[model samples]
Target: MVLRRDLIQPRIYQEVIYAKCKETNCLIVLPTGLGKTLIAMMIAEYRLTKYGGKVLMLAPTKPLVLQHAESFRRLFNLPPEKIVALTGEKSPEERSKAWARAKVIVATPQTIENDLLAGRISLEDVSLIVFDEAHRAVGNYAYVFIAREYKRQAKNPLVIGLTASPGSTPEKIMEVINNLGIEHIEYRSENSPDVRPYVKGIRFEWVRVDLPEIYKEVRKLLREMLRDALKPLAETGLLESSSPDIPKKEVLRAGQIINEEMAKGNHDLRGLLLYHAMALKLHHAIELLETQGLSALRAYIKKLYEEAKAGSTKASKEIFSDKRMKKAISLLVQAKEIGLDHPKMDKLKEIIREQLQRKQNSKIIVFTNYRETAKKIVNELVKDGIKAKRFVGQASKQREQKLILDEFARGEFNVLVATSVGEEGLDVPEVDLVVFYEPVPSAIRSIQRRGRTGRHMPGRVIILMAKGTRDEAYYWSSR
Candidate 1:
């Protein structure tokens, strides 16, 4: 029997897009939560019907493989024996048998990569291969190698790549195209008529804070010294007055040799000291620019104090005396007291609180990059008397699965704070809201985050941003 529309809803444009891809290897680029998976499922159905052959769906991680396998079982009226989710955790013998019997194999690239190399599975009969998070096709990723192998083995190969953001540069995008052997591209922005109705336009804002006065003073003193030292190079036109390039390592080495030679020649002590101080200042200025930025340089006087508390690195310490580095440390110690909280965090909390009040049983998934950041968020939510837990890959497979089920079903935990591990095909319970603690760099991550929500109802997502930081860059890149 044919699958019903309820099993897979068709987008006005996605149907057309899928029809076009049926004739050519295609890459589908749509923002998160815009039904890329549905399009893929539709294509899979078409292939199964037309070719009467098995399909292979490859995801990046094991959790994602399980998630996709779950989706296929639920959406398609396939028997249990017809579908399988394989990972390296399974023995080779088990995989070989499954490979022989299964029509749809949802798997991690590593597992499939090994199996392909071991002669456990043959791709000759496979009609279609789908690469989820297709952006990973670049670099030394096994997906690229697998794609090539599939092309080599299949009699009539059909490849469809799905990703939200391929990359920032055209070269990177082209690399994905080349690796996947994509002959056609379907790209839809959030505003594309086909996807617009499903996406809510995100608002972005930046919050900036000024350094404390003490810190500002240290920065000022350091800048003055830097200016004096750089003057000679600027006058010689070797360095630009406005934006002079810092001295190279060779220059520093040459200066050291000159100083040693001068000492040997019994050059005037005062002149020798002056040259040493000049070199020190130039080095400090370069460090300020390379590490901190322009604002830290302008606030030089504050540096002496900051440096005293947070001991400077060997490189920075070598530039000036330990005394200067110590003062820089002291300045930073005081400056550290100033905490800049992003208003976006407050906004996200507000959204979460509102949703909690409305749907007391609602499950929320918060996606973040670092485990420490996830723990910090969990602590904050707990302080507010909210029950939350972190779901990430740091735990073993058994523990991870147990935590997912317990927190989601029985435990007081109503929210799961996670990293990218939660993004792809893990069988995470239907979440009412998905919060991106910060914007992720890849379109695949954005898609995975959004996929967590809206499985049952219209889902909500809150992306917190620190205004002008790398957060904004990631936000725009997702689009």
Candidate 2:
């Protein structure tokens, strides 16, 4: 047998996807935990058997590259020596020699990008290239550069782009499609008849908690600070509106416009540029208050204070110089002193308690947007005598990140509070319950976080939202 059929069980949905992907360059949009790797493996086997060339796989992260390489070595009948996982660990000379001898290479895009530029390797003989977490193909990511170069150099090129959800908008999706040169799309939702039997039912619900009066008092002060920062720009025609509730996207667009105008010698915008930066900070601070808890807000305010004191930036110095900003910071301190935080924090604790009560050994994953919040959640859970840990994506701790995932899989901890590290390509272990400390507006992230659960067996997902805040707005946008 070409492959160890006993080790790799084929699913009907995967077979269907393979049939379509084999016909043309395709993008496979399947939920996480659905064996997207197996489909890629099937294509790799076909290409190597028919074309007799190497298979190139590019993933965004170091752990994912190792995971893909491990899968090929374990499932394919190829010799372990023939499969290589490349990271920044190897010297270029050794990597070049290994590339020449290897039949299958899985690598992070940055490493491959550097090697290609240094002329240390060539893609000419590579037959099939798989891009994992393919939604990131847009713009100037390394995926775009590698995809274009592979097509230019490969003898008989076939591409497969894998993602849980491609993009939120038609334009965004089209960008990835065009960038990858995708000719076909093979997509299946959990509700699809062919996929339904394999999908463990996930009961989904969102619990909304109202912000306390003290939190609103702090929010009001922050909003006034934001409005003051924005008003000058709005009056100067640098911003479309002066409202503190403006979307972050519009605010970012204004910065782009400011840069363009500055490049054209609009020196009058120099002061407005400072205001723009302050507006961004104020907006972020308000978001922390509304969505994240007071602890996060206090941490951010302390950061700003440190920056201002250390003479970091004119914007930060100016922000704290204002009485309104001081008032916001003091109110946050007062609120936290009284044991008040974002309502969602209380809700998250309650959800964890309920899940653990339902099944004493239930595995739970809590996803939060910030490292500060992840750390906070882990601390709070541990205080309740629950075994919990935080998983962060700090560059210095990449190895630590992998170790934490292993520990979680080994049941070293029953609860894992993760940052964005758990949302994407890593093979996070399946759990009994998945909780979103706050909803993500990105459809891709929302789908991925939910897919983490409801994979191995029956699971439940609970999203905590703060009433009348961005939490509610994001929940709806995610829906």
Candidate 3:
């Protein structure tokens, strides 16, 4: 028999992952909103049926780990007793009891690593181990060690690592594959024949906007500061040019050379390091002005000037004295006062209106790059003007961070905005529409995590918009 009668039928791509998952170690990469977890569930079911040991699922964050556990419980016909979630918030003794009782343990890598180190659990009985968001397995991340530990302990370890986009680069992608001791790659796209018919058709299109002059006006000032700061680096042949050709990559290259020079005692090490920090800050600030909303840019500038007021560094001092920096500061101050936000803010509202217009009371989840941007997005929505709230997580006693899907399922505020990092614990709204505030591709420091709500600034980005208009109109008009 298959899994629960209520569980949606698995598609061919999911079956492709499951077919390989029943035996060998593999990485299953697919697009967001696809059934990565479903594939894991089917595998978990098969492993439990055959080997009859526990299944261990590791995720980057506690919320996500627990979310996976919840998804499994919801999708299965079995009782909640079969699944257990491990996070630091639970006492070791409590986790030990849950581990004994539950067949599937969903846990963050840090908790699992520590538990294994403490000898709180053993993997001897584990038939399957799944790594969620497996792209983050590289480097010093907990996934690297946990995989090795599981292989050492599990008698017959079958591993599966799941990711949306494995990595932006070939090396990083290979890093995850190697880390998991993966033997096979099961990759699928929308065009894959068997998969294409099983899934909903997606309309691929772009909505365009012209950059506001005011935004460029700020980018110009910030760019000038970057040039002036890098002025001395060119004398050492450490810089290609302090010219307008400056990009984030070139700025980072300057940082590397600045540090190497410091290592050799060739220049003021502390001085280069300090401006390196400032240069990076300026680079992000210019980026915020260029791509993210004006409010986001204002929040960043206020922090810089605030740091200067505290007399932290000459970098801050230099920033304060720079006439262009002052101009950028005033530009934000005036923008906030007059309610001039990024042009995208207008586009966002148009989408929100459309989402509701299509289906009023439609729950929408707008994911952004930063908590600060989440606040800014909600604030702008309120002002422009739609009311919304930020969504957050779970625990027993306080029930504070603990978000029960029951309430959100009922009368919860319609649209909630939050960072994708929080994608684990909080509610992943089964919304009518999901809006990408800015183009953010996921990877742990494939670098420019600066946008970690992506680094509280902007990067060279793409903003996906489906502002309240789609295929339904034709169907409705025909009716």
What are the lDDT scores of the predictions, listed in order?
0.67, 0.81, 0.70
- The superposed Cα distance between candidate 1 and the true structure at residue 324, in angstroms, equals 8.5
Per-residue lDDT for 308-410 in model 3, tens only?
8988767878887888888887887777777777766777788788777876777666666656667777877877556577644222112432453344446
After superposing candidate 3, which stretches have Cα over 4 Å from the reference? 1-8, 12-190, 239-264, 268-288, 291-341, 346-365, 391-415, 421-434, 440-479
lDDT digits (tens) for residues 95-190 of candidate 1: 888888888889999888888888888888888899999998999999998999988889889999999888788999999999999999899876
> Candidates sorted by lDDT, descending order?
2, 3, 1
Identify the leading candidate in terms of TM-score. Answer: 2
Pairs clashing in candidate 2?
none
TM-score per candidate, in order?
0.57, 0.68, 0.58
Compared to the true structure, candidate 3 yields what TM-score? 0.58
Give the C-alpha miss distance for residue 240 in model 3, angstroms: 4.7
Count clashing pairs, candidate 2: 0
Worst 10 residues of 2 by lDDT: 449-458
